[PDB]
From a paper:
Wall teichoic acid (WTA) is a polyol phosphate polymer that covalently decorates peptidoglycan of gram-positive bacteria, including Staphylococcus aureus. Central to WTA biosynthesis is flipping of lipid-linked precursors across the cell membrane by TarGH, a type V ABC transporter. TarGH is a heterotetramer composed of two TarG polytopic transmembrane domains (TMD) and two TarH nucleotide binding domains (NBD). Like other ABC transporters, TarGH uses the energy derived from the ATP hydrolysis cycle in the NBDs to drive substrate transport across the membrane via the TMDs.
Residue numbers in the entry:
A (entry chain B), C (entry chain D): 1 to 264
B (entry chain A), D (entry chain C): 1 to 270
């Protein structure tokens, strides 16, 4: 079909310091060399419309960095990303203030998200109905519990209509009754032929939601393709890893971290 | 040329959003106080009181200036200082404090310091209305010359805003900036006609000539001309007007250029 | 055996305000009456040594309030709690500062928890080994990822040796390899015949870990007893609730919230 | 009697913890600065410079006091003021800011404002050593009388600490307290011998007699007696010593009583 997201040679580097003298010397001297850490390294993948892609890998692999670079909140050191369409991110807790009440927080967050005044006025009652807070919609958010804060954040955030959606480790929130509502909303979102990027550790959710898999290891793209051809490979690697000794796991992690650090 | 156009368009298209966010900030700041937003007037008033006992009662032995009682001279001269001080001190910190809440959203980033300034402009307007009302008890009633405020109250705002547009970027790249302004602003308080008037024709004459290079000089003197002296200020001091307009334009241009040059990498420095 | 925790007639009330004038008038006038919200209401239960008790209920029920009152961070309006032994709480993110490095954060958090200097010096290397950060132990915590922050917090926090333990919705953190380590630690904790309070929504984890169930509904203690006699009842209630209409659920929630509010 | 005993025991048993937490706070505050902890000395120094140009050069036309150059008089008199100002202003906010991090842990809660004060006492000690070294260039060398500092530097610390022990509790119950101190501290700066000396024998005589009820009077005058005048201060002013000791005791007693009365319900007000 049509390419919606196109990532070409994206690289992300960071500079590692030990004392303030090192930081100042690097800031001043143009030639000064220091250690450099490669968070990402030469990532290339093409996404199509209607593709649901799940990102998999161990801690520190670099999937939040990639989803921030796709989301637009972070910029590559090298390479480029071409987006066809508008991009949105599910970050439920971002715009909530404990000093404000729930009704005020709806307007505050919808304003920060980019909505116009008439749309905010029109869609406030539906959000209030969805969140199911009741009377506590008239109270400061600092008097809430954790589940109610999550429910309000999710209800405000799910009102977007983008072309590209990014979800980072939150598919459903609340108790057993709210989770079904959240899952139904996400499945409706998938039904409309929208491109979705999804980061998770729940492999059952990945199997029942995604259609493509992106395997990230050591800041690199290990593999990329259909779910039924790639997910079994990652699962086999995972099951093999649990069967090594502690020294073998330490050696594997040290070898992985060796290639990510370079003096330059 | 493109940076100026981008920042100008972003500010012009979002007037309502700037006002709304400033109001939400005012609500957030005073949330747990028993009195509420009343402190937005109570804190500036008390500071004036102290400044009257030290510099009016102690020094000067309560001596009038230019045929006016010293209390009203000081009152009209100091009304805009708290707005300038607070606006700059918090606009320097605005982006560092508020980038992460809107980074994932598509937001006009150049308006972040401006609404922080507007939240202080509200209290300035309240205090200025109170000062004009208080000046009527001595016998100083509004004249036609008061219309000059329509040029002078806006200009002050613009000046403050322009400065923050630079010092918000500088404060992200180098944090030590936040410690420098505290020392600079103090110099701008005492070397200004807010509390005292230089003698001129002497060793104080050079100090007066250097003081004329402070924009606070023009702001305070223009306010006093409109409210107290019943004079058209620009009929004798249009060169100072041109100098201050040039200053505001220079600050805005440099701030816009730097902001559009570095805004895409703000996550590195934060 | 011996009663370890004894809760008698614990009640928790909150005062609800709409404008600042109401708040000031209540502060000044001694007789002024206002709305009052009952977060808890006449809770009584006896806990024994070696009991693992799981707290269950829907959002807003009052289990975090009860676990804070048991933990000692909150005080009852009426009634009293008698503890036999020292009490600890698993709050992994509490003492972490993004400005400090990992090594500094270990000492900072262990100092705030109440340890002495010699113990901190002795147990730092084991914590460093457990967290498995590697070189990033020498970097500020604000340069970490989410999984690494959780791993460091858990590794610092699991070093306590209390008589009563309180866990609020965190049994394991990290990827698939760290979760087994966390579960083994928690099972070892259970093996030593320690009293554990556990708050969760995962009913499989509750079935495989706890031995008693405390059902909280509308700020009240609906039931309390053995796992195999009480958990099926809550599961039956939950399965019945999903089969009602939206109006029936709204009516149930409104009826529940009616009894919690009283003017006095 | 029990509240005093509890607070005293909690402070005595945790000397090392107080020092360590103060050091961690100093590290946290200056994390992103290029210069680092050097600002802990740079900020107080610059503020002195301005105060020399306004009150020494402008007013007074650089006139000596009591046979000493004005610069060293002011330098010795102002060295402890920044510590007092900052210590009180942040000790009033300490519990509100830091209760939630230690609430779940079993922690001595009365030591929270004290380590916030200690983090400023460090910079005070550095500045005082610099001032004593700088006084040697004019020809004022240390004498035996300098040993008096062993009573006077501690007392200052205690005074500040006692005040915070009250104003930390008051700041949790009523937030508006945080806005009042800003106005009170200013009054305590100008009505003190830090910048000027009252005339006495006149209308200024009553002001001098009222000024003697300020503890800052005793602090500055005792420091100057030990460093500049080569005099045993207590041989003429032991009544002021007793008055200030009584003040510190009263503040400590009231603060301990209120803190132990309300500490169990701090989560309600926060
Ligand atoms: C008390 C005083 C103490 C000392 C004061 C500070 C001394 C200077 C410090 C330098 C400093 C402050 C700004 C300085 C100028 C601002 C004022 C301007 C005038 C004001 C009236 C920025 O310095 C600027 O860095 C820019 C980099 O964007 C660079 O931009 C352009 O350059 C060319 C055209 O200039 C142009 O061709 C080029 O395309 C541009 O990039 C600028 O040239 C350079 O001046 C901050 O240091 C920065 O730290 C950053 C990590 O936080 C770091 O970026 C990251 O890059 C990689 C990507 O991940 C990765 O490796 C790391 O993440 C990290 O390395 C920067 O490299 C480093 O520099
Ligand atoms: C610009 C100025 C604006 C106005 C200024 C403020 C006006 C006064 C406001 C009163 C105020 C400030 C402290 C006042 C004195 C402090 C200075 C002392 C002297 C200083 C030199 C506290 O007031 C104090 O409240 C104490 C309650 O602990 C009470 O303590 C003792 O009383 C008896 C012995 O006094 C003794 O028998 C008794 O056992 C003690 O309880 C005190 O008597 C009373 O004075 C704050 O208001 C408080 O808000 C709290 C919710 O945050 C609220 O507690 C909660 O209680 C329930 C439990 O969940 C639940 O219903 C709610 O959660 C809530 O209701 C308090 O009820 C309310 O009062
Ligand atoms: C008067 C004064 C000089 C002047 C001074 O002391 N000087 C300088 C050279 C000549 C003359 C002298 O030789 O004494 C000063 O510098 O600061 C002051 C501060 C910081 C002051 O804060 C408060 C007062 C004050 C307030 C009310 C009343 Cl009713 C009375 C007082 C006050 C006076 C002075
Ligand atoms: C001198 C002065 C009076 C005194 C004054 O103006 N008075 C009061 C009654 C008599 C006399 C007068 O009638 O003019 C004052 O009040 O504030 C001042 C402020 C706030 C000042 O900040 C800076 C200076 C200053 C600094 C350096 C140099 Cl080299 C020169 C100046 C400075 C002077 C005065
Ligand atoms: N500012 C930074 N400076 C240096 N390294 C960083 C910085 N931010 C992130 N990293 C490192 O970049 C790597 C990738 O981090 P992330 O992408 O956030 O983690 P992740 O792959 O999503 O895995 P999780 O979230 O822990 S399961 C890790 O080694 C981080 O420590
Ligand atoms: N400060 C407060 N003032 C008023 N009501 C409060 C306050 N804190 C909590 N509540 C209410 O007390 C009730 C119990 O809250 P919690 O015990 O925190 O929630 P919960 O039972 O743990 O359920 P979760 O965590 O959302 S699954 C809820 O209705 C809260 O809104
Ligand atoms: Mg992550
Ligand atoms: Mg909870």
């Amino acid at each position: 079909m049509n390419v919606s997201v196109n990532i070409k040679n994206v690289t992300k580097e960071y500079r590692i310091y030990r004392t303030n003298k090192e930081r100042m010397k690097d800031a001043l001297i143009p030639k000064h060399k220091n250690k450099t850490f490669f968070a990402l390294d030469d990532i290339s993948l093409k996404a199509y419309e209607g593709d649901v892609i799940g990102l998999v890998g161990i801690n520190g692999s670099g999937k939040s960095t990639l989803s921030n670079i796709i989301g637009g909140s972070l910029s590559p050191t090298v390479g480029k990303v071409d987006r066809n369409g508008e991009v949105s991110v599910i970050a439920i807790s971002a715009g909530l203030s404990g000093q404000l009440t729930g009704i005020e927080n709806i307007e505050f967050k919808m304003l920060c998200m980019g909505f116009k005044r008439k749309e905010i006025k029109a869609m406030t009652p539906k959000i209030i109905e969805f969140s199911e807070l009741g009377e506590f919609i008239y109270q400061p958010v600092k008097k809430y519990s954790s589940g109610m804060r999550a429910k309000l954040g999710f209800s405000i955030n799910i009102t977007v209509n983008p072309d590209i959606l990014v979800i980072d480790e939150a598919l459903s929130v609340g108790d057993q009754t709210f989770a079904q509502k959240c899952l139904d909303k996400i499945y409706e979102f998938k039904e409309q032929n929208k491109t979705i990027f999804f980061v998770s550790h729940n492999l059952g959710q990945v199997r029942q939601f995604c259609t493509k898999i992106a395997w990230i290891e050591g800041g690199k793209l290990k593999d990329y393709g259909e779910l039924d051809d790639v997910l079994p490979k990652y699962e086999a690697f995972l099951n093999d890893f649990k069967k090594k000794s502690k020294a073998e796991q330490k050696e594997f992690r040290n070898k992985l971290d060796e290639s990510r650090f370079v003096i330059k | 040329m493109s940076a100026i156009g981008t920042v100008f368009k972003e500010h012009v298209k979002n007037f309502y959003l700037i006002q709304r966010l400033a109001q939400f900030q005012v609500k957030i700041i005073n949330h747990s106080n028993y009195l509420g937003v009343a402190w937005e007037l109570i804190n500036p008033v008390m500071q004036i009181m102290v400044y009257w006992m030290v510099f009016g009662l102690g020094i000067r032995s309560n001596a009038p200036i230019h045929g006016v009682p010293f209390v009203y001279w000081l009152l009209v001269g100091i009304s805009m200082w708290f707005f300038i001080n607070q606006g700059i001190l918090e606009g320097t910190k605005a982006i560092t404090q508020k980038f992460n809440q809107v980074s994932k959203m598509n937001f006009p980033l150049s308006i972040i310091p401006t609404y922080i300034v507007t939240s202080r402009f509200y209290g300035h307007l309240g205090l200025l209305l109170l000062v004009i009302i208080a000046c009527m008890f001595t016998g100083i009633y509004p004249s036609i010359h008061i219309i000059q405020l329509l040029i002078y109250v806006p200009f002050c705002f613009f000046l403050t805003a322009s400065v923050t547009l630079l010092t918000s970027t500088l404060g992200v790249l180098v944090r030590d900036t936040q410690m420098l302004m505290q020392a600079i602003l103090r110099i701008l308080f005492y070397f200004s006609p807010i509390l005292w008037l230089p003698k001129n024709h002497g060793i104080s004459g050079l100090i007066h000539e250097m003081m004329k290079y402070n924009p606070v000089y023009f702001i305070a003197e223009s306010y006093r001309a409109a409210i107290l002296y019943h004079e058209w200020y620009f009929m004798d001091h249009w060169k100072l007007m041109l100098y201050n307009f040039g200053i505001v334009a220079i600050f805005f241009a440099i701030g816009a250029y730097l902001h559009m040059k570095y805004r895409d990498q703000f996550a590195d420095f934060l």
